[PDB]
Symmetry: C2
Subunit: 260 residues, 2 copies
């Protein structure tokens, strides 16, 4: 399944009661992942929602158009996807760059968003010292070279040692991400600072951060939550891909929040 959205082709995947009547949840992935990263949440979510997952532009089985990409393109893909599938309004749960997209969507397109879960993210993620070298390395050396540095930021060393099959699966998706699509998203993320509009988010919002997350910090998640009136901040004992390392605690947090 693929949807032509902005003259760009996105791979997507639906779970839950299709004939049924349940609210939608849209899930939005981290840089260097694909929609498989949400597999631990799919069962619980499916009990309450129709679930829409997709591969972000430049990722997974989606197209990689010419970059640099921008936050507005990443926001527009989600809206266009929902347009295509005739989803008038949905809950939204995004991780890292997925959370950043959630910020833009919630601030600017609340008529399309019911509730927002903003996970392992910040209103402004990283800095040019992170994103510029990362995009050069991606472009000039390929993704295999990048995995060694990036993957340790995603999971604690204990989790990786204990779970070499999960790590190998996640690493395989990262290392096979289109290097240009990857760099072009590095550019979108670096260019995006949504700090000015976080305070304009008026939908119910949950911010999840990982205690051990160095890519988007607990301080950043608290800053994001404090900007949003009524936002709830939850910290998990995890690093950056918290929905995997702490799947049960993540899933329970998000489901409880969304079914309020």
């Amino acid at each position: 399944p693929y949807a032509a959205v902005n003259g760009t082709e996105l791979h997507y995947r639906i779970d839950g009661e299709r004939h049924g009547n349940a609210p939608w949840i849209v899930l939005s992935n981290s840089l260097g992942t694909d929609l498989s990263m949400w597999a631990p949440q799919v069962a619980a979510l499916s009990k309450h929602f129709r679930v829409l997952r997709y591969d972000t532009r430049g990722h997974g089985h989606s197209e990689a158009p010419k970059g640099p990409y921008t936050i507005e393109q990443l926001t527009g893909d989600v809206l266009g996807l929902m347009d295509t599938l005739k989803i008038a309004r949905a809950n939204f749960c995004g991780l890292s760059m997925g959370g950043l997209t959630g910020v833009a969507l919630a601030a600017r397109h609340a008529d399309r968003i019911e509730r927002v879960a903003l996970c392992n993210t910040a209103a402004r993620i990283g800095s040019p010292e992170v994103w510029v070298p990362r995009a050069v390395k991606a472009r000039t050396e390929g993704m295999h070279a990048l995995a060694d540095a990036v993957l340790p930021r995603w999971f604690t060393a204990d989790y990786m040692e204990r779970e070499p099959v999960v790590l190998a699966m996640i690493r395989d998706v990262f290392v096979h991400t289109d290097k240009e699509g990857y760099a072009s998203n590095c550019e979108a993320i670096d260019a995006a600072d949504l700090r000015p509009e976080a305070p304009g988010i008026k939908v119910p919002a949950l911010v999840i951060s990982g205690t051990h997350d160095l890519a988007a910090t607990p301080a950043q998640g608290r800053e994001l939550a404090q900007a949003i009136a009524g936002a709830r901040y939850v910290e998990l004992d995890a690093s950056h891909i918290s929905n995997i390392e702490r799947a049960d605690a993540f899933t329970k947090t998000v489901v409880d929040f969304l079914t309020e």
Copy 2:
């Protein structure tokens, strides 16, 4: 992502290791209801010694699901057409379940295309009409969620499943999103393939890996397979049917030492 139009279909494939290097090739072939992510625990170790080709079997993953039923000849020709497309002249081959079955066909009917074969959680005749006929009906008329609850417990021991809920969820996600017609047509292929008369004809070094808890393809069938094949060797792992996941480390080691001996 990479696709090749081959044998009258389109297959999604993936290459690891230096693709223009000089290391021998290895082609991996997946189980029914999986996609090429199932071999992710082996990729790192095999990339050290080999150029690695993985692919989504027809009806699976991101490959096309053409009109079924499928046959063991379509499945074999798929591997061959992919190799041909990549200019791969010969390769080691490691297949799990229907992948191991494909590997028996390939090693028997295409010895010159094959270096060494690892035939994993498999048999020269897998299951029986009493399993495959209702399976195909169920997949086609009820969809894959229904099948997942019956099939998945046959792939891992209870304890692994309890200990490894993230691995299970990811494997289940691929299984439940398999095209149902694609899956049923492969059921038909496997049920029709009885490679037992052809196995004694295999001329290349073979390794047979079986899981002591595998009910879908048994140790006993693993031994018969190994005994049909001149010089084949048999190794049994403390696992059920998807042994390259449940006992990844031992599986990897076994396959690597055998293929590089």
